[PDB]
Amino acid sequence: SALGKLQDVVNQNAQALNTLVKQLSSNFGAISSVLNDILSRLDPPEAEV
Amino acid sequence: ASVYAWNRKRISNCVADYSVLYNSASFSTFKCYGVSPTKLNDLCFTNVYA
């Protein structure tokens, strides 16, 4: 634990990145979190929504 | 079937050509939801219920 101060910095940033990446799995109300699935299923007028 | 006792046919393990239905002159209504009728032949489904 002696170098906890430096490890804390590493952990906070790694956590921030991991959270940011995981947000790409969120639908946010969309039919899918995967952009390619939306594009392959819907026409532009509906895909844009 | 009567609408109160509607029939459900489970379709699986087959090739589905939807353009035959969509390009037909014989249907008065053909409304797709959650999917484009012109992209159906490019999609795969785990199952289709008719």
Side-chain angles (χ1 to χ4, degrees):
Chain A
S1 64
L3 276 68
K5 287 182 179 180
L6 299 178
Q7 188 63 50
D8 285 339
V9 173
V10 172
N11 291 344
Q12 288 171 346
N13 287 283
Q15 185 178 61
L17 289 171
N18 287 338
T19 298
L20 180 63
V21 171
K22 286 178 180 179
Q23 286 298 100
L24 292 172
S25 296
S26 292
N27 290 332
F28 297 114
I31 60 171
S32 178
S33 66
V34 179
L35 183 57
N36 286 337
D37 289 342
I38 292 167
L39 293 169
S40 73
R41 285 168 58 175
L42 300 175
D43 288 343
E46 289 83 46
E48 288 183 4
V49 173
Chain B
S2 293
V3 71
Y4 90 95
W6 47 276
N7 192 81
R8 168 157 280 195
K9 170 69 175 177
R10 174 195 279 257
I11 297 169
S12 68
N13 298 308
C14 57
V15 180
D17 186 343
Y18 298 97
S19 301
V20 172
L21 298 170
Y22 191 70
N23 290 319
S24 172
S26 296
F27 301 121
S28 65
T29 300
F30 203 124
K31 295 178 180 177
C32 296
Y33 305 85
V35 65
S36 166
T38 60
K39 295 192 175 184
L40 288 170
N41 287 8
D42 294 323
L43 301 174
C44 289
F45 306 113
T46 60
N47 205 273
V48 180
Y49 291 110

Coordinates of all heavy atoms in Angstrom, one line a residue:
Chain A
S1 N 0.8 -1.2 0.0 CA 0.0 0.0 0.0 C 0.9 1.3 0.0 O 0.3 2.4 0.0 CB -0.9 0.0 1.2 OG -0.2 0.1 2.4
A2 N 2.2 1.1 0.1 CA 3.1 2.2 0.2 C 2.9 3.2 -1.0 O 3.0 4.4 -0.8 CB 4.5 1.7 0.3
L3 N 2.6 2.7 -2.1 CA 2.5 3.5 -3.3 C 1.1 3.7 -3.7 O 0.8 4.0 -4.9 CB 3.3 2.9 -4.5 CG 4.8 3.2 -4.6 CD1 5.5 2.5 -3.4 CD2 5.4 2.7 -5.9
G4 N 0.2 3.6 -2.7 CA -1.2 3.8 -3.0 C -1.6 5.1 -3.7 O -2.5 5.1 -4.5
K5 N -0.8 6.1 -3.4 CA -1.1 7.4 -4.0 C -0.9 7.4 -5.5 O -1.6 8.1 -6.2 CB -0.2 8.5 -3.4 CG -0.6 8.9 -2.0 CD 0.3 10.0 -1.5 CE -0.1 10.5 -0.1 NZ 0.8 11.5 0.5
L6 N 0.0 6.6 -6.0 CA 0.2 6.5 -7.4 C -0.7 5.5 -8.0 O -1.2 5.7 -9.2 CB 1.7 6.1 -7.7 CG 2.8 7.1 -7.2 CD1 4.1 6.5 -7.5 CD2 2.6 8.5 -7.8
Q7 N -1.0 4.5 -7.3 CA -1.9 3.5 -7.8 C -3.3 4.0 -7.9 O -4.1 3.6 -8.8 CB -1.9 2.2 -6.9 CG -2.6 1.0 -7.4 CD -2.0 0.5 -8.7 OE1 -0.8 0.3 -8.8 NE2 -2.9 0.3 -9.7
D8 N -3.7 4.9 -7.0 CA -5.0 5.5 -7.0 C -5.2 6.3 -8.3 O -6.3 6.3 -8.8 CB -5.2 6.4 -5.8 CG -5.4 5.7 -4.5 OD1 -5.8 4.6 -4.5 OD2 -5.2 6.3 -3.5
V9 N -4.2 7.0 -8.8 CA -4.3 7.7 -10.0 C -4.5 6.8 -11.2 O -5.4 7.1 -12.0 CB -3.0 8.6 -10.2 CG1 -3.0 9.2 -11.6 CG2 -2.9 9.6 -9.1
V10 N -3.8 5.7 -11.2 CA -3.9 4.7 -12.2 C -5.3 4.1 -12.2 O -5.9 3.9 -13.3 CB -2.9 3.6 -12.1 CG1 -3.1 2.5 -13.0 CG2 -1.5 4.2 -12.3
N11 N -5.8 3.8 -11.0 CA -7.1 3.2 -10.9 C -8.2 4.1 -11.3 O -9.2 3.6 -11.9 CB -7.3 2.7 -9.5 CG -6.4 1.5 -9.1 OD1 -5.8 0.9 -10.0 ND2 -6.3 1.3 -7.9
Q12 N -8.1 5.3 -10.9 CA -9.2 6.3 -11.2 C -9.3 6.5 -12.7 O -10.4 6.6 -13.3 CB -8.9 7.6 -10.6 CG -9.2 7.6 -9.1 CD -8.7 8.9 -8.5 OE1 -8.0 9.7 -9.1 NE2 -9.1 9.2 -7.2
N13 N -8.2 6.6 -13.4 CA -8.2 6.8 -14.9 C -8.6 5.5 -15.6 O -9.4 5.6 -16.6 CB -6.9 7.3 -15.3 CG -6.6 8.7 -14.9 OD1 -7.2 9.7 -15.5 ND2 -5.8 8.9 -13.9
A14 N -8.2 4.4 -15.1 CA -8.6 3.1 -15.8 C -10.1 2.9 -15.6 O -10.8 2.5 -16.6 CB -7.8 2.0 -15.1
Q15 N -10.6 3.3 -14.5 CA -12.0 3.2 -14.2 C -12.8 4.1 -15.1 O -13.9 3.7 -15.6 CB -12.3 3.5 -12.7 CG -13.7 3.3 -12.3 CD -13.9 3.5 -10.8 OE1 -13.7 4.6 -10.4 NE2 -14.3 2.5 -10.1
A16 N -12.3 5.3 -15.2 CA -13.0 6.3 -16.1 C -13.1 5.8 -17.5 O -14.1 6.0 -18.2 CB -12.3 7.6 -16.0
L17 N -12.0 5.2 -18.0 CA -12.0 4.7 -19.4 C -12.9 3.5 -19.5 O -13.6 3.4 -20.5 CB -10.6 4.3 -19.8 CG -9.6 5.4 -20.1 CD1 -8.2 4.8 -20.3 CD2 -10.0 6.2 -21.3
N18 N -12.9 2.7 -18.5 CA -13.7 1.5 -18.6 C -15.2 1.9 -18.6 O -16.0 1.3 -19.3 CB -13.4 0.5 -17.5 CG -12.1 -0.1 -17.6 OD1 -11.6 -0.3 -18.8 ND2 -11.5 -0.6 -16.6
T19 N -15.5 2.9 -17.8 CA -16.9 3.4 -17.8 C -17.3 3.9 -19.1 O -18.4 3.7 -19.6 CB -17.1 4.4 -16.6 OG1 -16.8 3.8 -15.4 CG2 -18.5 4.9 -16.6
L20 N -16.4 4.7 -19.7 CA -16.7 5.4 -21.0 C -16.9 4.3 -22.0 O -17.9 4.4 -22.8 CB -15.5 6.2 -21.4 CG -15.6 7.0 -22.7 CD1 -16.8 8.0 -22.6 CD2 -14.3 7.7 -23.0
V21 N -16.1 3.3 -22.0 CA -16.3 2.2 -23.0 C -17.6 1.4 -22.8 O -18.3 1.2 -23.8 CB -15.1 1.2 -22.9 CG1 -15.4 0.0 -23.8 CG2 -13.9 1.9 -23.4
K22 N -17.9 1.1 -21.6 CA -19.2 0.4 -21.2 C -20.4 1.2 -21.6 O -21.4 0.6 -21.9 CB -19.2 0.0 -19.8 CG -18.3 -1.1 -19.4 CD -18.3 -1.4 -17.9 CE -17.4 -2.5 -17.5 NZ -17.4 -2.8 -16.1
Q23 N -20.3 2.5 -21.7 CA -21.5 3.3 -22.1 C -21.9 3.1 -23.5 O -23.0 3.4 -23.9 CB -21.2 4.8 -21.9 CG -21.2 5.3 -20.4 CD -22.6 5.1 -19.8 OE1 -22.8 4.1 -19.0 NE2 -23.5 6.0 -20.0
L24 N -21.0 2.5 -24.3 CA -21.3 2.2 -25.7 C -22.2 1.0 -25.8 O -22.7 0.7 -26.9 CB -20.0 1.9 -26.5 CG -19.0 3.1 -26.7 CD1 -17.7 2.5 -27.3 CD2 -19.7 4.1 -27.6
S25 N -22.5 0.3 -24.7 CA -23.4 -0.8 -24.7 C -24.8 -0.3 -24.3 O -25.8 -1.1 -24.2 CB -23.0 -1.8 -23.7 OG -21.8 -2.4 -24.1
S26 N -25.0 1.0 -24.0 CA -26.3 1.5 -23.6 C -27.1 1.8 -24.8 O -26.7 2.4 -25.8 CB -26.1 2.7 -22.7 OG -25.5 2.4 -21.5
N27 N -28.4 1.6 -24.7 CA -29.4 1.9 -25.7 C -29.7 3.3 -25.7 O -30.0 3.9 -26.8 CB -30.6 1.0 -25.6 CG -30.3 -0.4 -25.9 OD1 -29.5 -0.8 -26.6 ND2 -31.1 -1.3 -25.3
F28 N -29.8 3.9 -24.5 CA -30.2 5.3 -24.4 C -31.6 5.5 -25.0 O -32.0 6.6 -25.4 CB -29.2 6.2 -25.0 CG -27.9 6.2 -24.4 CD1 -26.8 5.7 -25.1 CD2 -27.7 6.7 -23.1 CE1 -25.5 5.7 -24.5 CE2 -26.5 6.7 -22.5 CZ -25.4 6.2 -23.2
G29 N -32.4 4.5 -25.0 CA -33.8 4.6 -25.5 C -33.9 4.0 -27.0 O -35.0 3.9 -27.5
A30 N -32.8 3.8 -27.6 CA -32.8 3.3 -29.0 C -33.1 1.8 -29.0 O -33.0 1.1 -27.9 CB -31.4 3.5 -29.6
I31 N -33.5 1.3 -30.1 CA -33.8 -0.1 -30.3 C -32.6 -1.0 -30.1 O -32.7 -2.2 -29.8 CB -34.4 -0.4 -31.7 CG1 -33.4 0.0 -32.8 CG2 -35.7 0.3 -31.8 CD1 -33.8 -0.5 -34.2
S32 N -31.4 -0.4 -30.2 CA -30.1 -1.1 -30.1 C -29.0 -0.2 -29.7 O -28.9 0.9 -30.2 CB -29.8 -1.9 -31.3 OG -28.6 -2.6 -31.2
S33 N -28.0 -0.7 -29.0 CA -26.8 0.0 -28.7 C -25.8 -0.1 -29.8 O -24.8 0.6 -29.9 CB -26.2 -0.5 -27.4 OG -25.8 -1.9 -27.5
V34 N -26.1 -1.1 -30.7 CA -25.2 -1.3 -31.9 C -25.7 -0.5 -33.1 O -26.8 -0.7 -33.6 CB -25.2 -2.8 -32.2 CG1 -24.3 -3.0 -33.4 CG2 -24.7 -3.6 -31.0
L35 N -24.8 0.4 -33.5 CA -25.2 1.3 -34.6 C -25.4 0.6 -35.9 O -26.3 1.0 -36.7 CB -24.1 2.4 -34.7 CG -24.3 3.5 -35.7 CD1 -25.6 4.2 -35.4 CD2 -23.1 4.4 -35.7
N36 N -24.6 -0.4 -36.1 CA -24.7 -1.2 -37.3 C -26.0 -2.0 -37.4 O -26.5 -2.2 -38.5 CB -23.5 -2.1 -37.5 CG -22.3 -1.4 -37.8 OD1 -22.3 -0.3 -38.4 ND2 -21.1 -2.0 -37.5
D37 N -26.6 -2.4 -36.3 CA -27.8 -3.1 -36.3 C -29.0 -2.1 -36.7 O -29.9 -2.5 -37.4 CB -28.1 -3.7 -34.9 CG -27.2 -4.9 -34.6 OD1 -26.6 -5.4 -35.5 OD2 -27.1 -5.2 -33.4
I38 N -28.9 -0.9 -36.2 CA -29.9 0.1 -36.5 C -29.9 0.4 -38.0 O -30.9 0.5 -38.7 CB -29.7 1.4 -35.8 CG1 -29.9 1.2 -34.3 CG2 -30.5 2.5 -36.3 CD1 -29.5 2.3 -33.4
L39 N -28.7 0.5 -38.6 CA -28.5 0.9 -40.0 C -28.9 -0.3 -40.9 O -29.3 0.0 -42.0 CB -27.0 1.2 -40.2 CG -26.5 2.5 -39.5 CD1 -25.0 2.6 -39.6 CD2 -27.2 3.7 -40.2
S40 N -28.7 -1.5 -40.5 CA -29.0 -2.7 -41.3 C -30.5 -3.0 -41.3 O -31.0 -3.6 -42.2 CB -28.2 -3.9 -40.8 OG -28.7 -4.4 -39.6
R41 N -31.2 -2.5 -40.2 CA -32.6 -2.8 -40.1 C -33.5 -1.7 -40.7 O -34.4 -1.9 -41.4 CB -33.0 -3.0 -38.7 CG -32.6 -4.3 -38.1 CD -32.8 -4.4 -36.6 NE -34.1 -4.1 -36.2 CZ -34.5 -4.2 -34.9 NH1 -33.7 -4.5 -34.0 NH2 -35.8 -3.9 -34.7
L42 N -33.2 -0.4 -40.3 CA -34.0 0.7 -40.7 C -33.6 1.5 -41.8 O -32.4 1.7 -42.1 CB -34.2 1.6 -39.4 CG -34.8 1.0 -38.2 CD1 -34.7 2.0 -37.1 CD2 -36.2 0.5 -38.4
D43 N -34.5 2.1 -42.5 CA -34.3 3.2 -43.5 C -33.9 4.5 -42.8 O -34.4 4.7 -41.7 CB -35.5 3.3 -44.4 CG -35.7 2.2 -45.4 OD1 -34.8 1.4 -45.6 OD2 -36.7 2.1 -45.9
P44 N -33.2 5.4 -43.4 CA -32.7 6.6 -42.9 C -33.8 7.4 -42.1 O -33.5 7.9 -41.0 CB -32.2 7.4 -44.2 CG -31.8 6.2 -45.1 CD -32.7 5.1 -44.8
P45 N -35.0 7.6 -42.6 CA -36.0 8.4 -42.0 C -36.3 7.9 -40.5 O -36.7 8.7 -39.7 CB -37.2 8.1 -42.9 CG -36.6 7.8 -44.2 CD -35.4 7.0 -43.8
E46 N -36.1 6.6 -40.3 CA -36.4 6.0 -39.0 C -35.1 5.7 -38.3 O -35.0 5.8 -37.0 CB -37.2 4.7 -39.1 CG -38.6 4.9 -39.5 CD -38.8 5.1 -41.0 OE1 -38.3 4.3 -41.7 OE2 -39.6 6.0 -41.4
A47 N -34.0 5.4 -39.0 CA -32.7 5.2 -38.5 C -32.2 6.4 -37.8 O -31.6 6.3 -36.7 CB -31.7 4.7 -39.5
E48 N -32.4 7.6 -38.3 CA -31.9 8.8 -37.8 C -32.5 9.1 -36.4 O -31.8 9.6 -35.5 CB -32.3 10.0 -38.7 CG -31.4 10.0 -40.0 CD -31.7 11.2 -40.8 OE1 -32.5 12.0 -40.4 OE2 -31.1 11.3 -41.9
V49 N -33.7 8.6 -36.2 CA -34.4 8.8 -34.8 C -33.6 7.9 -33.8 O -33.4 8.4 -32.7 CB -35.8 8.4 -34.9 CG1 -36.4 8.4 -33.5 CG2 -36.6 9.4 -35.8
Chain B
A1 N -58.4 -18.1 -39.5 CA -59.0 -18.1 -38.2 C -59.8 -16.8 -37.9 O -59.5 -15.8 -38.5 CB -58.0 -18.3 -37.1
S2 N -60.7 -16.9 -37.0 CA -61.3 -15.7 -36.4 C -60.3 -14.9 -35.7 O -59.3 -15.5 -35.1 CB -62.5 -16.1 -35.5 OG -63.5 -16.6 -36.3
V3 N -60.4 -13.6 -35.6 CA -59.4 -12.8 -34.9 C -59.3 -13.1 -33.4 O -58.3 -12.8 -32.8 CB -59.7 -11.3 -35.2 CG1 -60.9 -10.9 -34.4 CG2 -58.5 -10.5 -34.8
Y4 N -60.4 -13.5 -32.8 CA -60.4 -13.8 -31.4 C -59.6 -15.1 -31.1 O -59.1 -15.4 -30.0 CB -61.8 -13.9 -30.9 CG -62.4 -15.3 -30.9 CD1 -62.3 -16.1 -29.8 CD2 -63.0 -15.7 -32.1 CE1 -62.8 -17.4 -29.9 CE2 -63.6 -17.0 -32.1 CZ -63.5 -17.8 -31.0 OH -64.0 -19.1 -31.1
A5 N -59.5 -15.9 -32.2 CA -58.8 -17.2 -32.1 C -57.8 -17.4 -33.2 O -57.8 -18.4 -33.8 CB -59.9 -18.3 -32.1
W6 N -57.0 -16.4 -33.3 CA -56.0 -16.3 -34.4 C -55.0 -17.4 -34.4 O -54.7 -18.0 -33.4 CB -55.3 -14.9 -34.3 CG -54.8 -14.6 -33.0 CD1 -55.5 -14.0 -32.0 CD2 -53.4 -14.8 -32.5 NE1 -54.7 -13.8 -30.9 CE2 -53.4 -14.3 -31.2 CE3 -52.3 -15.3 -33.1 CZ2 -52.3 -14.3 -30.4 CZ3 -51.1 -15.3 -32.3 CH2 -51.1 -14.8 -31.0
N7 N -54.6 -17.8 -35.6 CA -53.6 -18.9 -35.8 C -52.2 -18.4 -35.7 O -51.9 -17.3 -36.3 CB -53.9 -19.6 -37.1 CG -53.2 -20.9 -37.3 OD1 -53.6 -21.9 -36.7 ND2 -52.1 -20.9 -38.0
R8 N -51.3 -19.1 -35.1 CA -49.9 -18.8 -35.1 C -49.1 -19.9 -35.7 O -48.9 -21.0 -35.2 CB -49.4 -18.6 -33.7 CG -47.9 -18.5 -33.5 CD -47.5 -17.8 -32.3 NE -47.6 -16.3 -32.6 CZ -47.0 -15.4 -31.8 NH1 -46.3 -15.8 -30.7 NH2 -47.1 -14.1 -32.1
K9 N -48.4 -19.6 -36.8 CA -47.5 -20.5 -37.5 C -46.1 -20.1 -37.2 O -45.6 -19.0 -37.5 CB -47.8 -20.5 -39.0 CG -46.7 -21.3 -39.8 CD -46.8 -22.7 -39.6 CE -45.9 -23.5 -40.5 NZ -45.9 -25.0 -40.2
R10 N -45.3 -21.1 -36.6 CA -43.9 -20.8 -36.3 C -43.0 -21.2 -37.4 O -43.0 -22.4 -37.9 CB -43.5 -21.5 -35.0 CG -42.0 -21.4 -34.6 CD -41.6 -22.4 -33.5 NE -42.0 -21.9 -32.2 CZ -41.0 -21.4 -31.4 NH1 -39.8 -21.3 -31.7 NH2 -41.4 -21.0 -30.2
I11 N -42.2 -20.3 -38.0 CA -41.3 -20.5 -39.1 C -39.9 -20.5 -38.7 O -39.4 -19.5 -38.1 CB -41.6 -19.4 -40.2 CG1 -43.0 -19.6 -40.7 CG2 -40.6 -19.5 -41.3 CD1 -43.5 -18.4 -41.5
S12 N -39.1 -21.5 -39.1 CA -37.7 -21.6 -38.7 C -36.9 -22.4 -39.6 O -37.5 -23.2 -40.4 CB -37.6 -22.2 -37.3 OG -38.0 -23.6 -37.3
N13 N -35.6 -22.3 -39.6 CA -34.7 -23.2 -40.3 C -35.0 -23.2 -41.8 O -35.2 -24.2 -42.4 CB -34.7 -24.6 -39.8 CG -34.3 -24.7 -38.3 OD1 -33.2 -24.1 -38.0 ND2 -35.0 -25.3 -37.5
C14 N -35.0 -22.0 -42.4 CA -35.4 -21.8 -43.8 C -34.9 -20.5 -44.4 O -34.4 -19.6 -43.7 CB -36.9 -22.0 -44.0 SG -37.9 -20.8 -43.0
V15 N -35.1 -20.4 -45.7 CA -34.7 -19.1 -46.4 C -36.0 -18.3 -46.7 O -36.9 -18.8 -47.3 CB -34.0 -19.4 -47.7 CG1 -33.6 -18.2 -48.4 CG2 -32.8 -20.3 -47.4
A16 N -36.0 -17.1 -46.1 CA -37.2 -16.3 -46.2 C -37.0 -15.2 -47.3 O -36.2 -14.2 -47.0 CB -37.4 -15.6 -44.9
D17 N -37.7 -15.3 -48.4 CA -37.6 -14.2 -49.4 C -38.9 -13.3 -49.2 O -40.0 -13.7 -49.6 CB -37.6 -14.8 -50.8 CG -37.4 -13.7 -51.8 OD1 -37.6 -12.6 -51.5 OD2 -37.0 -14.0 -52.9
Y18 N -38.7 -12.2 -48.7 CA -39.8 -11.3 -48.3 C -40.1 -10.4 -49.5 O -41.1 -9.7 -49.4 CB -39.4 -10.4 -47.1 CG -39.1 -11.2 -45.9 CD1 -37.8 -11.5 -45.5 CD2 -40.2 -11.7 -45.1 CE1 -37.6 -12.3 -44.4 CE2 -39.9 -12.4 -43.9 CZ -38.6 -12.7 -43.6 OH -38.3 -13.4 -42.4
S19 N -39.2 -10.3 -50.5 CA -39.5 -9.4 -51.6 C -40.6 -9.9 -52.5 O -41.2 -9.1 -53.2 CB -38.2 -9.1 -52.4 OG -37.2 -8.6 -51.6
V20 N -40.8 -11.2 -52.4 CA -41.9 -11.8 -53.2 C -43.2 -11.3 -52.6 O -44.2 -11.1 -53.4 CB -41.9 -13.4 -53.0 CG1 -43.1 -14.0 -53.6 CG2 -40.7 -13.9 -53.7
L21 N -43.3 -11.1 -51.3 CA -44.5 -10.6 -50.7 C -44.6 -9.1 -50.9 O -45.7 -8.6 -51.2 CB -44.5 -10.9 -49.2 CG -44.5 -12.4 -48.9 CD1 -44.3 -12.5 -47.4 CD2 -45.8 -13.0 -49.2
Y22 N -43.5 -8.4 -50.7 CA -43.5 -6.9 -50.7 C -43.8 -6.4 -52.1 O -44.4 -5.4 -52.3 CB -42.2 -6.4 -50.2 CG -42.3 -4.9 -50.0 CD1 -43.1 -4.4 -48.9 CD2 -41.7 -4.0 -50.8 CE1 -43.3 -3.1 -48.7 CE2 -41.8 -2.7 -50.6 CZ -42.6 -2.2 -49.6 OH -42.8 -0.9 -49.4
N23 N -43.3 -7.1 -53.1 CA -43.4 -6.6 -54.5 C -44.7 -7.1 -55.2 O -44.9 -6.9 -56.3 CB -42.2 -7.0 -55.3 CG -41.0 -6.3 -54.9 OD1 -41.0 -5.1 -54.7 ND2 -39.9 -7.0 -54.9
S24 N -45.5 -7.8 -54.4 CA -46.8 -8.3 -54.9 C -47.8 -7.2 -55.1 O -47.8 -6.2 -54.3 CB -47.3 -9.3 -53.9 OG -48.6 -9.7 -54.3
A25 N -48.6 -7.3 -56.1 CA -49.6 -6.3 -56.3 C -50.9 -6.7 -55.6 O -51.9 -6.0 -55.7 CB -49.9 -6.3 -57.8
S26 N -50.9 -7.8 -54.9 CA -52.1 -8.4 -54.4 C -52.5 -8.0 -53.0 O -53.5 -8.3 -52.4 CB -52.0 -9.9 -54.4 OG -52.0 -10.4 -55.8
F27 N -51.6 -7.2 -52.3 CA -51.8 -6.8 -51.0 C -52.1 -5.3 -50.9 O -51.6 -4.5 -51.6 CB -50.6 -7.1 -50.1 CG -50.2 -8.6 -50.1 CD1 -49.0 -9.0 -50.5 CD2 -51.1 -9.5 -49.7 CE1 -48.6 -10.3 -50.5 CE2 -50.8 -10.8 -49.7 CZ -49.6 -11.2 -50.1
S28 N -53.1 -5.0 -50.0 CA -53.5 -3.6 -49.9 C -52.8 -2.9 -48.8 O -52.6 -1.7 -48.8 CB -55.0 -3.6 -49.6 OG -55.3 -4.2 -48.3
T29 N -52.4 -3.7 -47.8 CA -51.6 -3.2 -46.7 C -50.3 -4.0 -46.5 O -50.3 -5.2 -46.5 CB -52.4 -3.3 -45.3 OG1 -53.6 -2.5 -45.5 CG2 -51.6 -2.8 -44.2
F30 N -49.2 -3.3 -46.3 CA -47.9 -3.9 -46.1 C -47.1 -3.0 -45.2 O -46.3 -2.3 -45.8 CB -47.2 -4.3 -47.3 CG -46.2 -5.4 -47.1 CD1 -46.3 -6.6 -47.9 CD2 -45.2 -5.3 -46.2 CE1 -45.4 -7.6 -47.7 CE2 -44.3 -6.4 -46.1 CZ -44.4 -7.5 -46.8
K31 N -47.3 -3.0 -43.9 CA -46.7 -2.1 -43.0 C -45.7 -2.7 -42.1 O -46.0 -3.6 -41.4 CB -47.7 -1.3 -42.2 CG -48.7 -0.5 -43.0 CD -49.7 0.2 -42.1 CE -50.6 1.1 -42.9 NZ -51.7 1.7 -42.1
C32 N -44.4 -2.3 -42.2 CA -43.4 -2.9 -41.4 C -43.0 -2.0 -40.2 O -43.0 -0.7 -40.4 CB -42.1 -3.2 -42.2 SG -42.4 -4.4 -43.5
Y33 N -42.7 -2.6 -39.1 CA -42.4 -1.8 -37.9 C -41.1 -2.3 -37.3 O -40.9 -3.6 -37.2 CB -43.5 -2.0 -36.8 CG -44.8 -1.6 -37.3 CD1 -45.6 -2.5 -38.0 CD2 -45.3 -0.3 -37.1 CE1 -46.8 -2.1 -38.5 CE2 -46.5 0.1 -37.6 CZ -47.3 -0.8 -38.3 OH -48.5 -0.4 -38.8
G34 N -40.2 -1.4 -37.0 CA -38.9 -1.8 -36.4 C -37.9 -2.4 -37.4 O -36.8 -2.8 -37.1
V35 N -38.4 -2.3 -38.7 CA -37.6 -2.9 -39.8 C -38.1 -2.3 -41.1 O -39.3 -2.1 -41.3 CB -37.7 -4.4 -39.8 CG1 -39.1 -4.9 -40.1 CG2 -36.7 -5.0 -40.8
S36 N -37.1 -2.1 -42.0 CA -37.5 -1.7 -43.4 C -37.8 -2.9 -44.3 O -37.0 -3.8 -44.3 CB -36.4 -0.9 -44.0 OG -36.5 -0.7 -45.4
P37 N -38.9 -2.8 -45.1 CA -39.4 -3.8 -45.9 C -38.4 -4.1 -47.0 O -38.4 -5.2 -47.6 CB -40.7 -3.2 -46.5 CG -40.5 -1.7 -46.3 CD -39.7 -1.6 -45.1
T38 N -37.5 -3.2 -47.3 CA -36.6 -3.4 -48.4 C -35.2 -3.9 -47.9 O -34.3 -4.1 -48.7 CB -36.3 -2.1 -49.2 OG1 -35.9 -1.1 -48.3 CG2 -37.7 -1.6 -49.8
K39 N -35.1 -4.1 -46.6 CA -33.9 -4.6 -46.0 C -34.1 -6.0 -45.4 O -33.2 -6.6 -44.9 CB -33.4 -3.6 -44.9 CG -32.9 -2.3 -45.5 CD -32.2 -1.5 -44.4 CE -31.6 -0.2 -45.0 NZ -30.8 0.5 -44.1
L40 N -35.3 -6.5 -45.5 CA -35.7 -7.8 -44.9 C -34.8 -8.9 -45.5 O -34.5 -9.8 -44.7 CB -37.2 -8.1 -45.1 CG -38.1 -7.2 -44.3 CD1 -39.5 -7.5 -44.9 CD2 -38.0 -7.6 -42.9
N41 N -34.6 -8.9 -46.8 CA -33.8 -10.0 -47.4 C -32.3 -10.0 -47.0 O -31.6 -10.9 -47.3 CB -34.0 -10.0 -48.9 CG -35.3 -10.5 -49.4 OD1 -36.2 -10.7 -48.5 ND2 -35.5 -10.7 -50.6
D42 N -31.9 -8.9 -46.3 CA -30.5 -8.9 -45.8 C -30.4 -9.2 -44.3 O -29.3 -9.2 -43.8 CB -29.9 -7.5 -46.0 CG -29.8 -7.1 -47.5 OD1 -29.5 -7.9 -48.3 OD2 -30.0 -5.9 -47.8
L43 N -31.5 -9.5 -43.7 CA -31.5 -9.8 -42.3 C -31.7 -11.3 -41.9 O -32.3 -12.0 -42.7 CB -32.7 -9.0 -41.6 CG -32.6 -7.5 -41.8 CD1 -33.8 -6.8 -41.2 CD2 -31.3 -6.9 -41.1
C44 N -31.2 -11.7 -40.8 CA -31.5 -13.0 -40.2 C -32.2 -12.9 -38.9 O -31.9 -12.0 -38.1 CB -30.1 -13.7 -40.0 SG -29.4 -14.3 -41.5
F45 N -33.1 -13.8 -38.7 CA -33.9 -13.9 -37.5 C -33.8 -15.2 -36.8 O -33.6 -16.2 -37.5 CB -35.4 -13.5 -37.8 CG -35.5 -12.3 -38.5 CD1 -36.0 -12.3 -39.8 CD2 -35.3 -11.1 -37.9 CE1 -36.2 -11.1 -40.5 CE2 -35.4 -9.9 -38.6 CZ -35.9 -9.9 -39.9
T46 N -34.0 -15.2 -35.5 CA -33.9 -16.5 -34.8 C -35.2 -17.3 -35.0 O -35.2 -18.5 -35.1 CB -33.7 -16.3 -33.3 OG1 -34.8 -15.5 -32.7 CG2 -32.4 -15.6 -33.0
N47 N -36.3 -16.5 -35.2 CA -37.6 -17.1 -35.5 C -38.5 -16.1 -36.2 O -38.4 -14.9 -36.0 CB -38.2 -17.7 -34.3 CG -39.2 -18.8 -34.5 OD1 -40.3 -18.5 -34.8 ND2 -38.7 -20.0 -34.5
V48 N -39.5 -16.6 -37.0 CA -40.5 -15.8 -37.5 C -41.9 -16.4 -37.2 O -42.1 -17.6 -37.4 CB -40.3 -15.7 -39.0 CG1 -41.5 -14.8 -39.6 CG2 -39.0 -15.1 -39.3
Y49 N -42.7 -15.6 -36.6 CA -44.1 -16.0 -36.3 C -45.1 -15.4 -37.3 O -45.0 -14.2 -37.6 CB -44.6 -15.7 -34.9 CG -43.9 -16.4 -33.8 CD1 -43.0 -15.8 -32.9 CD2 -44.2 -17.8 -33.5 CE1 -42.4 -16.5 -31.9 CE2 -43.6 -18.5 -32.5 CZ -42.7 -17.8 -31.7 OH -42.1 -18.5 -30.6
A50 N -45.9 -16.2 -38.0 CA -46.9 -15.7 -38.9 C -48.3 -15.9 -38.3 O -48.8 -17.0 -38.3 CB -46.8 -16.4 -40.2

